[PDB]
């Protein structure tokens, strides 16, 4: 439609052509973590952060608003004729 949206669409087309490979969007020390764990298994002396590994995902936006409960108490409201809601 316009220059900005055409650049947007081209980038999105590239994103769709490429396989997302279910990626995790952050890569920490994989083999360093494995090596540190093997060092812990026998040598029994490894730094704590060396033992640690961290992995992140997208999760979602929308930062956990509390539930609406979608439903009252089944003593106040009745369907049309006497009858619970489901």
């Amino acid at each position: 439609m316009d220059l900005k949206q055409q650049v947007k669409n081209y980038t999105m087309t590239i994103r769709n052509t490429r396989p997302p490979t279910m990626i995790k969007e952050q890569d920490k020390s994989e083999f360093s973590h494995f090596r540190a764990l093997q060092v812990l298994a026998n040598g029994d002396e490894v730094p704590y952060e060396a033992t640690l590994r961290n992995v992140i995902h997208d999760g979602a936006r929308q930062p956990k608003l509390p539930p609406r409960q979608t439903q009252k108490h089944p003593g106040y409201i009745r369907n049309e004729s006497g009858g619970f809601f489901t």
Binding site: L3, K4, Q6, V7, Y10
Partner: protein, 187 residues
């Protein structure tokens, strides 16, 4: 890039008015400066680039090499102020045969000389603000006797004040142009 898009009547690649005009453009400065200032004649914003050593201060249209600006509109129009300095700009073209020509226009040059890959030509700029239109399809036919397919890259060197860069697909008149695609110089 700009492939599988829609170009029918106009295609604006650069506009001084916007949140970020150099979205797609790469900018390289060595002894110069780029900024956006409010012009006096056309009382609006114009993106100005200046600096010594014209051949080094410029902006390329595709963000990086190995990426082409696929655009098939014949006419190309720029809206520039004439600062009475050395100003030049270059446009690369793909012919019907897979050969990338390139034409450039300079205001410090006086003779045109066709070459296998280049065509330098003088430009007779007016005073102050003016829009310049390139056929860009008559040029390829007149130089190499071939047909125009699609532009690949655009590049504008130093000592100029840009307001509009747009492909037109035909020579529109001052009437047919919309409000944004014209020169309205106020009092």
């Amino acid at each position: 890039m700009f492939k599988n898009a829609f170009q029918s009547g106009f295609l604006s690649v650069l506009y001084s008015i916007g949140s970020k005009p150099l979205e797609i453009w790469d900018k390289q400065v060595s002894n110069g400066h780029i900024k956006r200032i409010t012009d006096a004649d056309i009382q609006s914003s114009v993106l100005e680039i200046m600096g010594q050593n014209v051949s080094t201060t410029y902006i390329t249209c595709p963000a990086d090499p190995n990426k082409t600006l696929g655009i098939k509109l014949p006419f190309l129009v720029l809206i520039i102020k004439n600062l009475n300095k050395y100003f030049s700009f270059e446009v690369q073209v793909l012919d019907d045969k897979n050969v990338r020509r390139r034409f450039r226009a300079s205001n410090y040059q006086s003779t045109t000389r066709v070459k296998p890959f280049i065509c330098t030509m003088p430009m007779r700029l007016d005073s102050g603000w003016n829009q310049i239109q390139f056929n860009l399809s008559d040029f390829t036919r007149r130089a190499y006797g071939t047909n125009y397919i699609e532009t690949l890259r655009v590049q504008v060197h130093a000592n100029c004040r840009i307001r509009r860069i747009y492909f037109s697909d035909r020579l529109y008149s001052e009437e047919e142009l919309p409000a944004e695609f014209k020169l309205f110089l106020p009092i």
